[PDB]
Amino acid sequence: STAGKVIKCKAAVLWEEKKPFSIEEVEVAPPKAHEVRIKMVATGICRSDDHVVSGTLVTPLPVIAGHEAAGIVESIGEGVTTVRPGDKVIPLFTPQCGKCRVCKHPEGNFCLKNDLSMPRGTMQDGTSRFTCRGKPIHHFLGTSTFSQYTVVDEISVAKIDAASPLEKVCLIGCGFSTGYGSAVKVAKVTQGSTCAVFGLGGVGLSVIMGCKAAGAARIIGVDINKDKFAKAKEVGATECVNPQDYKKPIQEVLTEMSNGGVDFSFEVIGRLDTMVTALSCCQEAYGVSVIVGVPPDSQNLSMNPMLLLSGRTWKGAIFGGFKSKDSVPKLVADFMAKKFALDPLITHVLPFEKINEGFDLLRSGESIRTILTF
Amino acid sequence: STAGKVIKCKAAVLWEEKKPFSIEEVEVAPPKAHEVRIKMVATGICRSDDHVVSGTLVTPLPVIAGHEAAGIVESIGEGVTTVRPGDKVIPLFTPQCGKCRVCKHPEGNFCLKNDLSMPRGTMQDGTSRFTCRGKPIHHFLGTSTFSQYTVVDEISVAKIDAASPLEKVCLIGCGFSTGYGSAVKVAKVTQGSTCAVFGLGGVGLSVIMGCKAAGAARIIGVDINKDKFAKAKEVGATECVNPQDYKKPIQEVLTEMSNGGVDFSFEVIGRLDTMVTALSCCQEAYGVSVIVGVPPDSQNLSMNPMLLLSGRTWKGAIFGGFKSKDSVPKLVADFMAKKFALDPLITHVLPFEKINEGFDLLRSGESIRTILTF
Numbered sequence A, B: 001s002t003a004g005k006v007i008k009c010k011a012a013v014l015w016e017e018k019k020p021f022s023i024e025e026v027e028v029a030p031p032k033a034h035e036v037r038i039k040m041v042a043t044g045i046c047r048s049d050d051h052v053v054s055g056t057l058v059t060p061l062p063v064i065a066g067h068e069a070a071g072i073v074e075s076i077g078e079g080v081t082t083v084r085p086g087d088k089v090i091p092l093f094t095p096q097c098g099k100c101r102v103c104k105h106p107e108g109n110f111c112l113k114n115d116l117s118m119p120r121g122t123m124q125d126g127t128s129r130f131t132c133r134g135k136p137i138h139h140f141l142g143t144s145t146f147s148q149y150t151v152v153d154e155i156s157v158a159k160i161d162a163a164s165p166l167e168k169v170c171l172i173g174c175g176f177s178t179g180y181g182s183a184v185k186v187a188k189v190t191q192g193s194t195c196a197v198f199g200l201g202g203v204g205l206s207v208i209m210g211c212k213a214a215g216a217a218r219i220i221g222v223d224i225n226k227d228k229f230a231k232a233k234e235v236g237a238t239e240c241v242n243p244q245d246y247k248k249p250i251q252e253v254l255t256e257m258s259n260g261g262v263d264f265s266f267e268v269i270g271r272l273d274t275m276v277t278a279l280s281c282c283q284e285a286y287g288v289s290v291i292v293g294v295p296p297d298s299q300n301l302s303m304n305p306m307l308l309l310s311g312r313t314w315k316g317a318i319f320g321g322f323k324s325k326d327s328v329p330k331l332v333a334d335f336m337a338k339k340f341a342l343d344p345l346i347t348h349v350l351p352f353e354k355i356n357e358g359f360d361l362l363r364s365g366e367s368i369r370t371i372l373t374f
Ligand SMILES: NC(=O)c1cccc([C@@H]2O[C@H](COP(=O)([O-])OP(=O)(O)OC[C@H]3O[C@@H](n4cnc5c(N)ncnc54)[C@H](O)[C@@H]3O)[C@@H](O)[C@H]2O)[nH+]1
Pocket: A045, A046, A047, A048, A051, A174, A175, A178, A198, A199, A200, A201, A202, A203, A204, A222, A223, A224, A225, A228, A243, A268, A269, A270, A271, A274, A292, A293, A294, A295, A317, A318, A319, A320, A362, A365, A368, B309
């Protein structure tokens, strides 16, 4: 609650990998110059949060994970000029400093001030802003939303429409904007095409949302979990295929299906093998494959270059190509206009304290987006 | 000489790999329906022909190689509607049947009627047209220009300007069009950019011509053969770097000098390691790397997918993305208009019978384009 100094509150501290979170009490310092303390209204559980724990996404531990969320501004640090206190806002795991090459470039969005390439697990000041027990707790992507309170740089915050249903709109902070932006922005799906999506999770379903918004005539969802098929078709898919039903490789099954290959295929899972399979399954001469999943730390994939030579283009993208600070508020306005719907991504809405359970729903395959309410 | 039936002539027969070409006599059968027999005026020695002999580019032996050339039409088979006898023309290693998905696709150029991905070593009808000693000989890419006379399908030949200088314009059938097409068509270099070119041979120098035509503000040519630098700077390079001069990895060097990365990188060598290196030396968030070199048969390259997650786009292409039959004629016209120049690429012009020598000049790094005259 209200302040101008240290706050004590609950947070999901992750002490070690392959362990559960420990909802604990933390001291959340006040916002320094150019930072903001935000009161977390709702939080989505993205697979990336799960990667931290399983050790596939290496970041410094202990740490308060969480990054897909929406909240309200409790206070503002010296100089902040973009968000006033009481404003509904959305943190940003991909900032938008406005000064580096990337923010200046009309196309790139992966700002040089991100904490994803090389995790420090600190604030821009290179300092923390959390303490549990006596020890300091690392940040995550300069967001860390698994806490009632958090403080992010002005660089990583976006003022959102006052009438926003923060319990829906938090998805736009990762899951949706990524998948929808991969399809409509990075890959640039065209009316009439035929896409293929690998991974029918929250982002996967969001890519199908983009393709369908882009006008793809066919949308082949691929997943080893038959249960994901209905949500898929509901949001946009035209058919769904499960690798395990076939006696011949999926790229073969897909090429045959597409009469030679896909127009645009997407890897929204995270494994090396499916990264290649997604590439190979697209048209050798003009197919585009967009890598969306995040692979396992320091692992190299092997693929034969002829796949590229023929004319295939392989792209990768973070946050769906979107320039964070400009995009999110604009995206929210669209949600308002009803130009899209986040409902189909939402399958559970547990309360913060049951975080470990929402993660269990993920890894078991019975959920999609599970919204932690605070 | 003129006919309507078998013609006996000279040709460079490749009997086995890692062996010299054998200049000998062949019976070049007359053109079947929709085929064309052509009299070879001039031919260029492209690195690919050399791959064949090294075994890097697996194609069936024995074979009459060659693919970049211009000639005049001796005879035409039944139904031919595009070229008459006496027209100056250019065979095309990249077909353009006009009926397949690719040819119909406004963007892709790699025709489904090509013999590059799955080298048969025949004509469209699955039959040869060359007989040496007593046994039949395979064709190459459906062109095979290292013969005084050859027969190409109507789909693999382009009629070019009657007044075109065939011993210059032959370069347009491969080396030029690909290098120039990679940069202007494929990667779409932009005014002001900073491009980097791996390999300063015929195709590379043509890419430098592309980048410069596109308006790149900086073009850094990389090559281990110091000798290649003057010509490179000559065609448009702004600077030249040689891997062996530095004590630190080339991508690190390029990135440091380009202030965090190049806008467009090109790989025109065909080496696996430099295919990755060229990828990594480009801007993490918006860099585009186009692979142009042709890799060693069945070899897989290992690379960290995170490289693409950041935002990089990896492209690959054959014939610079130019749609063959419609492009060549138009490009030739541009030559005539003095829209570009092939002269700098030509450093030797040996007579056909000196083929094995022109090949030595390649392997010894002292040539670029050695035009063989017939
Ligand atoms: N680059 C970015 O901006 C960005 C954004 C968001 C998430 C990510 C990454 O993308 C990935 C997925 O995100 P999510 O939607 O939250 O995760 P999720 O766990 O909800 O979905 C994973 C889906 O993949 C399916 N899948 C898994 N294995 C296979 C397989 N072997 N073959 C076929 N299908 C399979 C699985 O059944 C599930 O439906 C994950 O790797 C995450 O780290 N990156």
